[PDB]
Amino acid sequence: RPRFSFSIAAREGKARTGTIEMKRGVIRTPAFMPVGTAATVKALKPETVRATGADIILGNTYHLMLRPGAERIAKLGGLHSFMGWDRPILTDSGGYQVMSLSSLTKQSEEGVTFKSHSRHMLSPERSIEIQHLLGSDIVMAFNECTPYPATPSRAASSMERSMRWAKRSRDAFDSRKEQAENAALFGIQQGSVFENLRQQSADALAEIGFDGYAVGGLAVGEGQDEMFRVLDFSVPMLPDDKPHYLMGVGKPDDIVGAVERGIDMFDCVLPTRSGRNGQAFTWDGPINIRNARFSEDLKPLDSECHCAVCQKWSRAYIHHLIRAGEILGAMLMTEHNIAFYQQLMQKIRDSISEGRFSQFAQDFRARYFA
Amino acid sequence: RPRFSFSIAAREGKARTGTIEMKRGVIRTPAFMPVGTAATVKALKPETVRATGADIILGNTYHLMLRPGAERIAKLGGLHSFMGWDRPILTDSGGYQVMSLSSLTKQSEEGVTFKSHSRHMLSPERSIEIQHLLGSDIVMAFNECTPYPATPSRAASSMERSMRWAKRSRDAFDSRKEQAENAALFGIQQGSVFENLRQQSADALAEIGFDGYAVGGLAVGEGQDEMFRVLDFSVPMLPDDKPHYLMGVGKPDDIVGAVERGIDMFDCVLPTRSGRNGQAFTWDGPINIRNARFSEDLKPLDSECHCAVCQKWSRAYIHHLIRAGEILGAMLMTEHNIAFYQQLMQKIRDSISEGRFSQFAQDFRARYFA
Ligand SMILES: CNc1nc2cc3c(=O)[nH]c(N)nc3cc2[nH]1
Ligand SMILES: CNc1nc2cc3c(=O)[nH]c(N)nc3cc2[nH]1
Ligand SMILES: [Zn+2]
Ligand SMILES: [Zn+2]
């Protein structure tokens, strides 16, 4: 019913669990968002995505503006209607994908001009408009993702431009009455691995004011140790009373450690992509289902998993499908992996609410990395 | 409950509608069997195959004996358990696929030796044993599919060898108590396009005695006109009181015409394969969903179709998925096409039972080829 209402029900150290209420549904936090880059969570019907426990999925301004096009999607009744997902959708703003996917790129204070992997423009104003056209529930400010590594000086100028673009994103979003009334807007913290820059970035974002705050510029090659180090000081800089979104993260251990450091929201292509590639997540660590050791294994992918795939099909069958290149193989692997991620989020939420998250993290790691 | 019981409830001309009762379920006839060659109906969960209306699916001795192997499947508890389809499964005997898929082939009275697309042997005895190991409900006699075209002399010798192999198939099947008690055995009529050979073949099959009778050696390049001509005289040669299975057919019009000529059972990869390739069946004829005319079409694939895909998704969305190479595109297209085939079978069954099948065929053709 409300536009955006974040409520924290319980805490343990820096970890929080709670809910975000939005018009299209409730999002339980910490939350994992399956990635639906081309207006589909790959190899899954929306009803199946929902069955795994997902409360919200991620879309991409960059991909959708090229194909099938933002105005086209609006004309077809918006992204929710187009793809048949009626619950919240967060859309990334294009800033990251334009830098890692576009064949050619030209950056200025105005924004980015780029070549389609066809010439196109992105700016805070255009990014916000595209997300309006898509009908996103959570809109990301348009920004620049600083390349890693970066000098303090390069990170500084990059972060400052992002903060200028964040103000313009805010203004463009607020200018659109229907967007301001029905959607929410998140700012993106930058500043690379440098504490003083992260602080200035957080101060700039808080001064503008956002519904939520993402930690950007991580999961860009820095490694877990470095990422955790940056999170240690960066997350406490963000407003405590708003959701904290870590963009593009990540592996189960990354998620657990990030929650221990105050992160409430996550997205990664890992469960879907590695699913298609034969990697299945289990509580005993990942396994590669193509491996010959599984050819006659009648056990489910994981012994505890409650997902429909593990209720019905054996490792041996899925091993066969994946090795035969069968589509059903990708479907079952993906459903299980997304279900595994959601069960991980559930156990995280339950353990925080019950004040035993520290013990869960320890138990999880000891078994997962055995 | 019974092993195999075919009951004809209604007739119109040569057309029949009825049921086959088997231990694993009832098969409504005329029936269409989705093809599950690699132990999966491509891009569909078994529950979805069942949701479209399928009563029975087809498996292949040839593919399964290579991958994952027949003894392996038996060890894993049989094909039904392996793939999660608990209803009847008909398995082809290998005879056709060994000739059109094997890189090299050596034929004798014993059987066929061949190279895996690894060296392997097939014979009536080995074929029956493989199908036993798979746990097929309807077992096909091992035969030779005569190449088209063929001289009368070549068709004759080929047909005669098939009839000898049919006797051996019968004997091998009957020798296996558990198979004889729980499964059924179909013979395959051969004789190419020649009436006298079709007759001798039918006489040979009837003298041996089978639970059902397939018309083999068609859908091999002869064209609909020729196929219908052969069916005109061939089907009445088969026992009237047993099911009549036309192997590898086919397009909707082929199915309707074949039912008009006394066929009760069908299988084809057309709905699944062409589904993945962008072809969707509609009552107004097939359409190619990739075509630009569909990019903003909000209508479902077909306006009358009752399938879940047409209840929820637009042509525009599916057009997008298929053009983006997205797996969900293949999933939705395949579900709709199999659902369309099953709805066609239902309308055929209803119209025969109501004595208005002639009118249905006429109405169907006038609209489908408009
Ligand atoms: C997979 N790793 C990953 N790091 C990211 C950083 C950002 C970022 O700083 N900005 C925006 N807009 N998206 C992002 C997406 C990411 N995805
Ligand atoms: C797609 N066209 C097609 N014609 C067929 C004929 C036979 C046949 O004569 N014998 C056996 N064993 N399978 C068959 C499968 C076919 N599939
Ligand atoms: Zn599972
Ligand atoms: Zn349909």
Short mmCIF file of N, CA and C in Angstrom, two decimals, chain A residues 65-206:
data_model
loop_
_atom_site.label_atom_id
_atom_site.label_comp_id
_atom_site.label_asym_id
_atom_site.label_seq_id
_atom_site.Cartn_x
_atom_site.Cartn_y
_atom_site.Cartn_z
N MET A 65 16.79 -0.57 -23.02
CA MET A 65 16.65 0.63 -23.84
C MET A 65 17.07 0.33 -25.28
N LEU A 66 17.91 -0.69 -25.43
CA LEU A 66 18.35 -1.14 -26.75
C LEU A 66 17.35 -2.14 -27.31
N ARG A 67 16.97 -3.11 -26.49
CA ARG A 67 16.10 -4.18 -26.94
C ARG A 67 15.21 -4.63 -25.79
N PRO A 68 13.89 -4.49 -25.95
CA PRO A 68 13.17 -4.04 -27.15
C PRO A 68 12.99 -2.53 -27.28
N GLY A 69 13.54 -1.74 -26.36
CA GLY A 69 13.33 -0.31 -26.36
C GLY A 69 12.39 0.14 -25.25
N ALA A 70 12.69 1.28 -24.63
CA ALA A 70 11.93 1.74 -23.48
C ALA A 70 10.55 2.26 -23.88
N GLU A 71 10.48 3.06 -24.93
CA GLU A 71 9.20 3.58 -25.40
C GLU A 71 8.31 2.43 -25.86
N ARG A 72 8.90 1.45 -26.53
CA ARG A 72 8.15 0.26 -26.93
C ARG A 72 7.55 -0.47 -25.71
N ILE A 73 8.36 -0.71 -24.69
CA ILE A 73 7.87 -1.35 -23.48
C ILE A 73 6.75 -0.54 -22.81
N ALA A 74 6.91 0.78 -22.76
CA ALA A 74 5.86 1.62 -22.20
C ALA A 74 4.57 1.46 -23.01
N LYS A 75 4.71 1.46 -24.33
CA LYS A 75 3.55 1.34 -25.20
C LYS A 75 2.86 0.00 -25.00
N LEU A 76 3.64 -1.02 -24.66
CA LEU A 76 3.10 -2.35 -24.42
C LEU A 76 2.56 -2.50 -23.00
N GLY A 77 2.62 -1.41 -22.23
CA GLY A 77 2.01 -1.39 -20.92
C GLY A 77 2.96 -1.49 -19.74
N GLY A 78 4.26 -1.35 -19.98
CA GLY A 78 5.24 -1.32 -18.90
C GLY A 78 5.92 -2.67 -18.70
N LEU A 79 7.07 -2.68 -18.04
CA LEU A 79 7.87 -3.91 -17.88
C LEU A 79 7.13 -5.02 -17.14
N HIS A 80 6.44 -4.67 -16.04
CA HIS A 80 5.70 -5.65 -15.25
C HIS A 80 4.74 -6.45 -16.11
N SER A 81 3.93 -5.74 -16.87
CA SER A 81 2.95 -6.34 -17.76
C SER A 81 3.64 -7.13 -18.87
N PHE A 82 4.65 -6.52 -19.48
CA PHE A 82 5.38 -7.12 -20.60
C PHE A 82 5.88 -8.54 -20.24
N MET A 83 6.55 -8.66 -19.11
CA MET A 83 7.21 -9.92 -18.76
C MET A 83 6.39 -10.78 -17.79
N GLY A 84 5.28 -10.23 -17.30
CA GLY A 84 4.40 -10.97 -16.41
C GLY A 84 4.88 -11.11 -14.98
N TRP A 85 5.61 -10.12 -14.49
CA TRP A 85 6.02 -10.09 -13.09
C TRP A 85 5.34 -8.89 -12.46
N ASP A 86 4.42 -9.13 -11.52
CA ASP A 86 3.58 -8.04 -11.00
C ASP A 86 4.07 -7.45 -9.68
N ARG A 87 5.23 -7.92 -9.23
CA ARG A 87 5.82 -7.51 -7.95
C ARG A 87 6.91 -6.45 -8.18
N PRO A 88 7.58 -5.97 -7.11
CA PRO A 88 8.57 -4.92 -7.36
C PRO A 88 9.72 -5.29 -8.31
N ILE A 89 10.19 -4.30 -9.06
CA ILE A 89 11.36 -4.46 -9.92
C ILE A 89 12.30 -3.29 -9.66
N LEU A 90 13.56 -3.58 -9.37
CA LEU A 90 14.58 -2.53 -9.27
C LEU A 90 15.29 -2.50 -10.61
N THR A 91 15.50 -1.32 -11.17
CA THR A 91 16.29 -1.21 -12.41
C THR A 91 17.59 -0.48 -12.17
N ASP A 92 18.70 -1.07 -12.61
CA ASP A 92 19.96 -0.36 -12.58
C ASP A 92 19.91 0.74 -13.63
N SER A 93 20.77 1.74 -13.49
CA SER A 93 20.57 3.01 -14.20
C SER A 93 21.29 3.09 -15.55
N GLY A 94 22.12 2.10 -15.84
CA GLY A 94 22.82 2.03 -17.11
C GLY A 94 24.29 2.37 -16.98
N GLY A 95 24.64 3.04 -15.88
CA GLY A 95 25.97 3.60 -15.70
C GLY A 95 27.09 2.58 -15.71
N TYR A 96 26.83 1.42 -15.12
CA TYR A 96 27.83 0.36 -15.03
C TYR A 96 27.91 -0.43 -16.33
N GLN A 97 26.76 -0.74 -16.90
CA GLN A 97 26.71 -1.60 -18.07
C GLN A 97 27.21 -0.86 -19.29
N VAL A 98 26.98 0.44 -19.34
CA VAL A 98 27.44 1.23 -20.47
C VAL A 98 28.97 1.23 -20.54
N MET A 99 29.62 1.07 -19.40
CA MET A 99 31.08 1.12 -19.34
C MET A 99 31.71 -0.25 -19.60
N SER A 100 31.01 -1.32 -19.25
CA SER A 100 31.56 -2.67 -19.41
C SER A 100 31.02 -3.42 -20.62
N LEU A 101 29.97 -2.89 -21.25
CA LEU A 101 29.40 -3.57 -22.41
C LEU A 101 29.51 -2.82 -23.74
N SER A 102 29.55 -1.49 -23.69
CA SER A 102 29.57 -0.68 -24.91
C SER A 102 30.92 -0.71 -25.62
N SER A 103 30.89 -0.97 -26.92
CA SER A 103 32.09 -1.11 -27.73
C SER A 103 32.92 0.17 -27.74
N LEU A 104 32.23 1.30 -27.76
CA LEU A 104 32.89 2.60 -27.72
C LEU A 104 32.14 3.50 -26.75
N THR A 105 32.85 4.45 -26.15
CA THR A 105 32.29 5.28 -25.09
C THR A 105 32.87 6.70 -25.10
N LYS A 106 32.02 7.70 -24.92
CA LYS A 106 32.46 9.08 -24.78
C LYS A 106 31.80 9.76 -23.58
N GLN A 107 32.60 10.12 -22.59
CA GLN A 107 32.09 10.66 -21.33
C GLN A 107 32.26 12.18 -21.21
N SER A 108 31.26 12.84 -20.63
CA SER A 108 31.32 14.27 -20.39
C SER A 108 30.46 14.62 -19.19
N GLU A 109 30.35 15.91 -18.87
CA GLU A 109 29.52 16.33 -17.75
C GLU A 109 28.04 16.07 -18.08
N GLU A 110 27.71 16.18 -19.36
CA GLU A 110 26.35 15.90 -19.84
C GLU A 110 25.93 14.46 -19.53
N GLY A 111 26.81 13.51 -19.82
CA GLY A 111 26.51 12.10 -19.65
C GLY A 111 27.44 11.25 -20.51
N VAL A 112 26.96 10.09 -20.93
CA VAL A 112 27.74 9.18 -21.76
C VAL A 112 27.11 8.98 -23.14
N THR A 113 27.89 9.13 -24.20
CA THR A 113 27.44 8.68 -25.53
C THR A 113 28.17 7.37 -25.84
N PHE A 114 27.48 6.43 -26.49
CA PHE A 114 28.03 5.09 -26.66
C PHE A 114 27.47 4.32 -27.85
N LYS A 115 28.20 3.29 -28.28
CA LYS A 115 27.79 2.46 -29.40
C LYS A 115 27.19 1.14 -28.92
N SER A 116 26.05 0.77 -29.51
CA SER A 116 25.35 -0.46 -29.14
C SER A 116 26.11 -1.72 -29.56
N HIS A 117 26.29 -2.63 -28.62
CA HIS A 117 26.96 -3.89 -28.89
C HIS A 117 26.12 -4.78 -29.80
N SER A 118 25.07 1.08 -33.58
CA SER A 118 23.99 1.98 -33.19
C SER A 118 24.46 2.93 -32.08
N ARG A 119 24.22 4.23 -32.27
CA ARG A 119 24.66 5.23 -31.31
C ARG A 119 23.55 5.64 -30.34
N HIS A 120 23.91 5.80 -29.07
CA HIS A 120 22.94 6.14 -28.04
C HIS A 120 23.52 7.08 -26.98
N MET A 121 22.63 7.75 -26.26
CA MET A 121 23.04 8.67 -25.21
C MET A 121 22.44 8.25 -23.88
N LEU A 122 23.20 8.43 -22.81
CA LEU A 122 22.68 8.26 -21.47
C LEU A 122 23.10 9.46 -20.64
N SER A 123 22.18 9.93 -19.80
CA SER A 123 22.40 11.06 -18.92
C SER A 123 21.52 10.81 -17.70
N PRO A 124 21.73 11.57 -16.61
CA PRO A 124 20.82 11.34 -15.47
C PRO A 124 19.36 11.50 -15.89
N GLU A 125 19.07 12.54 -16.66
CA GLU A 125 17.70 12.80 -17.09
C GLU A 125 17.14 11.68 -17.97
N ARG A 126 17.92 11.23 -18.95
CA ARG A 126 17.47 10.17 -19.85
C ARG A 126 17.33 8.83 -19.13
N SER A 127 18.23 8.57 -18.19
CA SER A 127 18.20 7.32 -17.44
C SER A 127 16.94 7.25 -16.60
N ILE A 128 16.67 8.33 -15.87
CA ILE A 128 15.45 8.40 -15.06
C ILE A 128 14.19 8.23 -15.92
N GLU A 129 14.15 8.91 -17.07
CA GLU A 129 13.03 8.80 -18.00
C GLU A 129 12.83 7.37 -18.52
N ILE A 130 13.93 6.70 -18.87
CA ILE A 130 13.84 5.31 -19.31
C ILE A 130 13.23 4.43 -18.21
N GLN A 131 13.69 4.63 -16.98
CA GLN A 131 13.17 3.84 -15.87
C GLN A 131 11.71 4.15 -15.59
N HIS A 132 11.32 5.41 -15.79
CA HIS A 132 9.92 5.78 -15.71
C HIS A 132 9.14 5.01 -16.77
N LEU A 133 9.62 5.05 -18.01
CA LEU A 133 8.96 4.36 -19.11
C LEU A 133 8.83 2.85 -18.84
N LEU A 134 9.88 2.26 -18.28
CA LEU A 134 9.85 0.84 -17.92
C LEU A 134 8.86 0.57 -16.80
N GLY A 135 8.64 1.57 -15.96
CA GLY A 135 7.74 1.43 -14.83
C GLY A 135 8.39 0.77 -13.63
N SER A 136 9.70 0.99 -13.47
CA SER A 136 10.44 0.44 -12.32
C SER A 136 9.88 0.95 -11.01
N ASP A 137 9.90 0.07 -10.00
CA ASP A 137 9.50 0.45 -8.65
C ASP A 137 10.63 1.08 -7.87
N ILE A 138 11.84 0.54 -8.02
CA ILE A 138 13.01 1.17 -7.42
C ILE A 138 13.94 1.61 -8.53
N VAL A 139 14.14 2.92 -8.60
CA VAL A 139 14.91 3.55 -9.66
C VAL A 139 16.29 3.88 -9.12
N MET A 140 17.34 3.54 -9.86
CA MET A 140 18.71 3.85 -9.43
C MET A 140 19.16 5.18 -10.05
N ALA A 141 19.84 6.02 -9.27
CA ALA A 141 20.44 7.23 -9.82
C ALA A 141 21.45 6.85 -10.90
N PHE A 142 21.61 7.72 -11.89
CA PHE A 142 22.58 7.46 -12.94
C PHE A 142 23.93 7.92 -12.43
N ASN A 143 24.96 7.11 -12.65
CA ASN A 143 26.26 7.36 -12.05
C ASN A 143 27.35 6.86 -12.95
N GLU A 144 28.58 7.00 -12.47
CA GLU A 144 29.74 6.39 -13.09
C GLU A 144 30.32 5.36 -12.11
N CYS A 145 30.58 4.15 -12.59
CA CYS A 145 31.27 3.16 -11.78
C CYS A 145 32.77 3.33 -12.02
N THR A 146 33.49 3.77 -10.99
CA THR A 146 34.93 3.96 -11.09
C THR A 146 35.63 2.64 -11.40
N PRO A 147 36.48 2.63 -12.43
CA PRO A 147 37.31 1.46 -12.73
C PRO A 147 38.23 1.14 -11.56
N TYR A 148 38.48 -0.14 -11.33
CA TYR A 148 39.41 -0.57 -10.29
C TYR A 148 40.62 -1.24 -10.94
N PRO A 149 41.84 -0.87 -10.51
CA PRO A 149 42.12 0.16 -9.50
C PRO A 149 42.05 1.58 -10.05
N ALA A 150 42.07 2.56 -9.14
CA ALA A 150 42.05 3.97 -9.52
C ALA A 150 42.87 4.79 -8.54
N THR A 151 43.56 5.81 -9.04
CA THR A 151 44.29 6.72 -8.17
C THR A 151 43.28 7.44 -7.30
N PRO A 152 43.72 8.00 -6.16
CA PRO A 152 42.76 8.75 -5.34
C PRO A 152 42.19 9.93 -6.13
N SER A 153 43.02 10.56 -6.95
CA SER A 153 42.59 11.71 -7.74
C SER A 153 41.55 11.34 -8.80
N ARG A 154 41.74 10.20 -9.46
CA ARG A 154 40.78 9.76 -10.47
C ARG A 154 39.48 9.30 -9.83
N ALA A 155 39.59 8.64 -8.68
CA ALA A 155 38.41 8.20 -7.97
C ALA A 155 37.62 9.41 -7.49
N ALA A 156 38.35 10.44 -7.07
CA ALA A 156 37.73 11.67 -6.57
C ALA A 156 36.89 12.36 -7.64
N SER A 157 37.51 12.64 -8.79
CA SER A 157 36.80 13.33 -9.86
C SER A 157 35.63 12.50 -10.35
N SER A 158 35.82 11.18 -10.43
CA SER A 158 34.74 10.30 -10.85
C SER A 158 33.59 10.32 -9.85
N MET A 159 33.92 10.23 -8.57
CA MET A 159 32.91 10.23 -7.52
C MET A 159 32.13 11.56 -7.52
N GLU A 160 32.86 12.67 -7.65
CA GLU A 160 32.23 13.98 -7.65
C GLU A 160 31.25 14.16 -8.81
N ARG A 161 31.62 13.72 -10.00
CA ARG A 161 30.70 13.75 -11.13
C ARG A 161 29.45 12.90 -10.84
N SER A 162 29.65 11.70 -10.30
CA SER A 162 28.53 10.86 -9.89
C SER A 162 27.59 11.59 -8.92
N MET A 163 28.18 12.33 -7.98
CA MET A 163 27.37 13.04 -7.00
C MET A 163 26.59 14.18 -7.67
N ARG A 164 27.20 14.84 -8.65
CA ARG A 164 26.47 15.84 -9.42
C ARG A 164 25.32 15.19 -10.20
N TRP A 165 25.59 14.04 -10.80
CA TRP A 165 24.57 13.28 -11.53
C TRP A 165 23.47 12.74 -10.60
N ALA A 166 23.84 12.45 -9.35
CA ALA A 166 22.85 12.01 -8.37
C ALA A 166 21.85 13.13 -8.07
N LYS A 167 22.33 14.36 -7.93
CA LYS A 167 21.43 15.49 -7.74
C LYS A 167 20.50 15.63 -8.94
N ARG A 168 21.04 15.54 -10.15
CA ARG A 168 20.22 15.66 -11.36
C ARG A 168 19.20 14.51 -11.49
N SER A 169 19.60 13.33 -11.04
CA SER A 169 18.70 12.18 -11.04
C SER A 169 17.52 12.41 -10.12
N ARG A 170 17.83 12.88 -8.91
CA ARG A 170 16.85 13.28 -7.91
C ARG A 170 15.86 14.28 -8.50
N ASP A 171 16.39 15.34 -9.11
CA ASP A 171 15.55 16.39 -9.69
C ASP A 171 14.67 15.87 -10.83
N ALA A 172 15.24 15.06 -11.71
CA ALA A 172 14.47 14.49 -12.82
C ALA A 172 13.35 13.56 -12.33
N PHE A 173 13.68 12.75 -11.33
CA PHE A 173 12.73 11.83 -10.72
C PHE A 173 11.60 12.64 -10.07
N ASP A 174 11.97 13.65 -9.27
CA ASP A 174 10.98 14.48 -8.57
C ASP A 174 10.09 15.29 -9.52
N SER A 175 10.61 15.58 -10.71
CA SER A 175 9.87 16.33 -11.73
C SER A 175 8.75 15.51 -12.34
N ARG A 176 8.87 14.20 -12.26
CA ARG A 176 7.88 13.29 -12.81
C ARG A 176 6.92 12.81 -11.71
N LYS A 177 5.78 13.49 -11.62
CA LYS A 177 4.83 13.31 -10.53
C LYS A 177 4.43 11.85 -10.31
N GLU A 178 4.15 11.15 -11.40
CA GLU A 178 3.70 9.77 -11.34
C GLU A 178 4.81 8.84 -10.86
N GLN A 179 6.05 9.21 -11.16
CA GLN A 179 7.19 8.42 -10.71
C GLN A 179 7.43 8.68 -9.22
N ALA A 180 7.39 9.95 -8.84
CA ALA A 180 7.66 10.36 -7.46
C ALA A 180 6.61 9.79 -6.51
N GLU A 181 5.38 9.67 -7.00
CA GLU A 181 4.29 9.16 -6.18
C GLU A 181 4.29 7.64 -6.02
N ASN A 182 4.81 6.93 -7.01
CA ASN A 182 4.66 5.47 -7.04
C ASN A 182 5.94 4.65 -6.94
N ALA A 183 7.08 5.28 -7.22
CA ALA A 183 8.35 4.59 -7.21
C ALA A 183 9.26 5.16 -6.13
N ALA A 184 10.43 4.55 -5.98
CA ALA A 184 11.42 5.02 -5.02
C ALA A 184 12.74 5.23 -5.76
N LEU A 185 13.61 6.04 -5.18
CA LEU A 185 14.86 6.41 -5.81
C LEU A 185 16.03 6.12 -4.88
N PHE A 186 17.02 5.37 -5.36
CA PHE A 186 18.20 5.05 -4.56
C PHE A 186 19.40 5.83 -5.08
N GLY A 187 20.24 6.34 -4.18
CA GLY A 187 21.50 6.95 -4.59
C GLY A 187 22.59 5.89 -4.59
N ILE A 188 23.69 6.15 -5.29
CA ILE A 188 24.81 5.21 -5.33
C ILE A 188 26.10 5.85 -4.81
N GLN A 189 26.61 5.33 -3.70
CA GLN A 189 27.87 5.75 -3.14
C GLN A 189 29.05 5.31 -4.01
N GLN A 190 29.99 6.22 -4.23
CA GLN A 190 31.22 5.89 -4.95
C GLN A 190 32.41 6.30 -4.09
N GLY A 191 33.59 6.35 -4.69
CA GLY A 191 34.79 6.67 -3.94
C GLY A 191 35.81 5.54 -3.90
N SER A 192 35.56 4.48 -4.66
CA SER A 192 36.55 3.40 -4.82
C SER A 192 36.86 2.74 -3.48
N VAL A 193 38.14 2.56 -3.17
CA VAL A 193 38.52 1.92 -1.91
C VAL A 193 38.98 2.93 -0.86
N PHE A 194 38.74 4.21 -1.12
CA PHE A 194 39.29 5.25 -0.27
C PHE A 194 38.26 5.79 0.72
N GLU A 195 38.60 5.76 2.00
CA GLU A 195 37.67 6.11 3.07
C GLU A 195 37.17 7.55 3.00
N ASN A 196 38.08 8.49 2.75
CA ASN A 196 37.67 9.89 2.73
C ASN A 196 36.70 10.18 1.58
N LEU A 197 36.88 9.48 0.46
CA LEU A 197 36.02 9.70 -0.71
C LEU A 197 34.65 9.06 -0.51
N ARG A 198 34.64 7.87 0.08
CA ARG A 198 33.40 7.21 0.46
C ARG A 198 32.58 8.10 1.39
N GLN A 199 33.26 8.77 2.32
CA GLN A 199 32.60 9.67 3.25
C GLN A 199 31.98 10.88 2.56
N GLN A 200 32.77 11.55 1.72
CA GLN A 200 32.27 12.70 0.98
C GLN A 200 31.09 12.27 0.12
N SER A 201 31.21 11.11 -0.51
CA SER A 201 30.13 10.58 -1.32
C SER A 201 28.87 10.37 -0.49
N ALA A 202 29.01 9.70 0.65
CA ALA A 202 27.86 9.47 1.53
C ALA A 202 27.24 10.79 2.00
N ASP A 203 28.08 11.75 2.37
CA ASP A 203 27.60 13.06 2.79
C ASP A 203 26.79 13.74 1.68
N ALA A 204 27.32 13.69 0.46
CA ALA A 204 26.63 14.26 -0.70
C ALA A 204 25.28 13.60 -0.93
N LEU A 205 25.24 12.27 -0.84
CA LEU A 205 24.00 11.54 -1.07
C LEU A 205 22.97 11.88 0.00
N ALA A 206 23.41 11.92 1.25
CA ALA A 206 22.50 12.16 2.37
C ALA A 206 21.94 13.57 2.31
#
